[PDB]
Design a protein around this ligand. Structure first.
Ligand SMILES: *c1nonc1-c1n[nH]c(-c2nonc2[N+](=O)[O-])n1
Ligand SMILES: *c1nonc1-c1n[nH]c(-c2nonc2[N+](=O)[O-])n1
Lengths: 306, 306
């Protein structure tokens, strides 16, 4: 037993991380087959990024302007093109460590693992949830541009995030591997800011089920409530409305614990209304919303990857 | 910025994980050069482990009794020996993916990354602290025997933990890679239990410095206190005494923030005495003690590994 925020093993992604240098700018790139993917911001200069014209900036580039380093081996760039906010550098060498992979965009409320990287060298790995306002609460220092987020599903790496920048509140914004931002952000210097967030209700319920599975039961009660009566309490406390689809997603956990979804909603209602009165749940004094139903089933049942 | 519980990238360890099978028992092993290290409990049977005699159990074994599987390749065992609670299976093939490594024992209060594994297949990676009572608050399901804990330091993997078992309170116990238990536990079925824990005071102070670096300042104050006057408050709340050596360890963080160690002790004193009054620190409503000064400097400055 035990419940921990757990990232996927990062080896398959570590073997794809490279360093991309253009001019005086260095960031991380992702080397899969004979293409290196990185943020197009690598072609920007000190003045450029306020209203940079990336089309103009790219046409002024040559393949030799791009220095791509995979460990202590330099990769030769033979083509360059841009897809939205990502740059694609075609190289003369296919990555022999290319895992089976997909480019998938995730939904708000979903989780992924981040491999923090600097100068193409991986630094640490941690789990993030995509917030409802399309930011993530990460840990990124200067040089982390291009670090990727991913999930692993059997042996296939589904890449879903490439890091770009930090917003004024300290949260982080980036794109999918097609170069399309998550959220209303741009790869320009503006006073852009996150905008209002909400709590991911179904994940909180999933986490309460995780807690029951792990022996934390003090918050349970005999009461129930209706899905409509819960959702009226959810709005006062800035929780997302609950759907029958989310009730359906919680079915397996509800059956394994024998606690009806609607009963756990009653417990969440009292927790929101009364607080926790000095007690903790899975070592937390706060209701945690960064674990999906899948994450809970994964860790409270235990599948491994190859 | 941002502060996250962050594990080391796990690739170098993933490439060492194998499956060891003896009889009807299967667990994880660690393949380095031509040796596979695993818990000696793999040679135990249903009846054996109450007062098993491992010396007797091992002499009754042959090399062919040990099935070692590295992915979809079977390794041939050519020698076996026991070192304390670990089994060493010499195999005819040196692991071509062997990283530079060390076997190091850690201290209570120190952190490491755990690569959770099942049937030789890595599942997830997360950070753990060695508690003062020599347990860890992990996430392990059946089949996780032999999963290893480690730190990485430049390119060298320092292995410090091999997982054995779960105690009645849901916490976890294991050994170092020499097979010596952390704490007063044995690899026998007994009613052994964890015994009293305490909070790692220097880590809490490190985390408060992390919070200040990341813009959380509401808990700061003008007051100071003496090291002796702090330690008297620390005992009431079951915190470890503070040492000048811990003050010395906190020197760099104190200088970077300009907050004297003794002033942050004053802040911790008020937090313990008053609680947090509905506010949070680095997203937590509890004082967190599972980050070392090194962990904070790592993430609030940003070194990468190769
Ligand atoms: C790194 N990788 O992709 N984009 C980046 C990046 N670094 N800085 C920015 C940026 N975009 O808009 N404002 C900023 N900034 O303030 O650094 N993007
Ligand atoms: C797995 N790897 O190393 N040791 C193990 C293990 N599995 N079960 C035990 C054990 N030792 O004492 N009691 C138990 N038990 O209750 O399972 N060790």
């Amino acid at each position: 037993s035990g419940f921990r925020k757990m990232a996927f093993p990062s080896g398959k992604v570590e073997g794809c991380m490279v360093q991309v240098t253009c001019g005086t700018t260095t960031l991380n790139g992702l080397w899969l087959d004979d293409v290196v993917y990185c943020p197009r911001h690598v072609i920007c200069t000190s003045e450029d990024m306020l209203n940079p014209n990336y089309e103009d900036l790219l046409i002024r580039k040559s393949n030799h302007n791009f220095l791509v380093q995979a460990g202590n081996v330099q990769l030769r760039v033979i083509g360059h093109s841009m897809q939205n906010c990502v740059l694609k550098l075609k190289v003369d060498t296919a990555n022999p460590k290319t895992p089976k992979y997909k480019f998938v965009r995730i939904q708000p409320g979903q989780t992924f693992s981040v491999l923090a990287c600097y100068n193409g060298s991986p630094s640490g790995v941690y789990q993030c949830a995509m917030r409802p306002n399309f930011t993530i609460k990460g840990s990124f220092l200067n040089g982390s541009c291009g670090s990727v987020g991913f999930n692993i599903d059997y042996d296939c790496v589904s890449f879903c995030y490439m890091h770009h920048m930090e917003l004024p509140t300290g949260v982080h914004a980036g794109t999918d591997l097609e170069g399309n931002f998550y959220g209303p952000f741009v790869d320009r210097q503006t006073a852009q800011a996150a905008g209002t967030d909400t709590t991911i209700t179904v994940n909180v319920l999933a986490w309460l089920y995780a807690a029951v599975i792990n022996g934390d039961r003090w918050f349970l009660n005999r009461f129930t409530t209706t899905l409509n009566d819960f959702n009226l309490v959810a709005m006062k406390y800035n929780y997302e409305p609950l759907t029958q689809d989310h009730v359906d997603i919680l079915g397996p956990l509800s059956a394994q614990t024998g606690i009806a979804v609607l009963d756990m909603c009653a417990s969440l209602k009292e927790l929101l209304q009364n607080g926790m009165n000095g007690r903790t749940i899975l070592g937390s004094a706060l209701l945690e919303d960064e674990f999906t139903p899948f994450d809970v089933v994964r860790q409270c049942s235990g599948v491994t990857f190859q």
